[PDB]
């Protein structure tokens, strides 16, 4: 590739990548319906690493869970979650399909298309991220959806719906590009083909323009999906752009990034030069090294002082607490709660605990609790993974989606 047209990530530190995989390994034993994440299975299968027989047991439990929750299930499965399960099936070389899951995912897309409306003036009940992910998951199972469904996602890309105040929301843009790439390879939605092929170029160009001087695309956690999109096909400047991203990824791993299992599961494929598009026709005898358990570090003795602020409740709340150095924001919330007259609530997600209430105020429709480093810098990690530094002030703020 003397011309530098292929997006590659060469010469990654072997032990940083091993340790990244070892962070997923313990999660292979968390098999309850409340903790299963099909993206973990996909990410491991597309990676240079494996967990042996634990993978087969994980897939067995995924199958029982998604089969039980088709419309003894406990919580309603979103379209995107079912889509990730479809990706897990392809990672084991299994093909669906009148399949009930295929139909359920198609009807999810129909519901979201209706929410968006004929004038693209509405919004999905979930997100354009889940919309694109669901189109992609159907496509890799060789299943087409109606042009009217695909048109909504094309329109959003064509009208730059995922750029806000000049900043591209890279993850959703990249996911849309992955879906479009799959449609193009099957020649699905052929009446939309010129739009599809241009939109692939638009996504790639917008991703490249979102590259920061440091080398990440948007932010370090959007970079895995951005790299998937760039790796689907060679292009001018991709070699050089992806070498900058390599530098950013290495520095981030050295600095302790990528603790979150969902994020690890998005990064592992691209470190192995694979993407979700490999799930059309995947190698199911891929070369992968067995992971072994990491050794856990000694107890952290130092402490950090962190101020927790909530101004979207009446009366507002502010308290400085101390926790062990390396404790999470969740630990800070727990310490504040222990000190009295502070409460919070969460719900499970495939990314871990999602903050849903603070001081008795539950996020309503189209609202969420945003986590910020004062002043006004949104955190890049959620409560379980963000580790506050001494002297930081963290704000919880209820905002409109
Ligand atoms: C859509 C989305 C949101 C929406 C979710 C609501 C909706 N309308 O669906 C909104 C805008 C509310 C949101 C909020 C946040 N998000 Co967000 N989000 C995403 C996105 C684009 C897609 C998620 C999705 O649908 N996945 C597919 C479905 C099937 O999976 P799921 O687990 O069932 O989806 C749920 C969770 O993702 C959850 N949620 C969304 N984001 C986050 C982040 C964390 C850490 C957790 C625990 C949960 C959570 O909401 C989804 C719907 O219920 C991802 C992109 C990505 N690369 O994954 C980023 C992403 C997951 N979010 C991220 C972050 C950091 C946040 C926030 C912490 C930002 C902040 N500073 O407040 C908050 C969450 C705080 C809290 N209250 O706990 C990061 C996480 C990185 C990491 N290291 O883990 C990502 C990767 C984006 C990025 N590149 O920065 N998010
Ligand atoms: N509107 C988009 C989602 C945009 C979005 O919620 N982006 C959040 C996700 S946490 C974000 O701030 N992303 C980081 C960024 O844009 O840099 C969709 O429908 O998929
Ligand atoms: Cl992380
Ligand atoms: Cl609460």
Residue numbers in the entry: 15 to 85, 95 to 120, 124 to 427
Give verbatim lines from the article.
B12 is obtained from food and travels from the stomach, through the intestine, and into the bloodstream by three B12-transporting proteins: salivary haptocorrin (HC), gastric intrinsic factor, and transcobalamin (TC), which all bind B12 with high affinity and require proteolytic degradation to liberate Cbl. B12 uptake is a finely orchestrated process involving a number of structurally related high-affinity B12-binding proteins, which protect B12 and carry it through cell membranes via specific protein–receptor interactions. Like the previously elucidated bovine and human TC-Cbl structures, recombinantly expressed rat TC consists of two domains: (i) an N-terminal, disulfide-bonded, α-helical six-hairpin glycosidase-like α-domain and (ii) a C-terminal β-stranded ubiquitin-like β-domain, the two linked by an interdomain loop. In the shown structure, Cbl is sandwiched between the α- and β-domains of rTC in a base-on conformation.
In this paper, we present the complex crystal structure between rat transcobalamin (rTC) and GSCbl. We obtained crystals of rTC that diffracted to 1.2 Å resolution at pH 5.5 in the presence of GSH and to our surprise we observed continuous electron density emanating from the Co of the Cbl ring system corresponding to GSH. GSH binds at the β-axial site, located between Cbl and the α-domain of rTC. Therefore, most interactions are formed with residues located in the α-domain. The Co–S bond is approximately 2.4 Å, the Co–dimethylbenzimidazole base bond is 2.2 Å and the corrin fold angle is 6.6°, which is defined as the butterfly angle between N21, C4, C5, C6, N22 C9, C10, and C10, C11, N23, C14, C15, C16, and N24. The majority of the 14 polar interactions between GSH and rTC are formed through solvent molecules. However, direct side chain interactions are present between Ser195, Thr198, and GSH. The strongest interaction is found between the α-helix dipole of α6 (Tyr154 and Tyr155), which interacts with the carboxylate of the γ-glutamate group of GSH. When the β site of Cbl is occupied by a strong ligand such as cyanide or GSH, the TC α7/α8 loop is disordered (bovine TC) or folds outward into the solvent (rat and human TC) and forms little hydrogen bonds with the rest of the protein. Our structure of rTC in complex with GSCbl clearly displays the broad specificity of TC concerning β groups of Cbl.
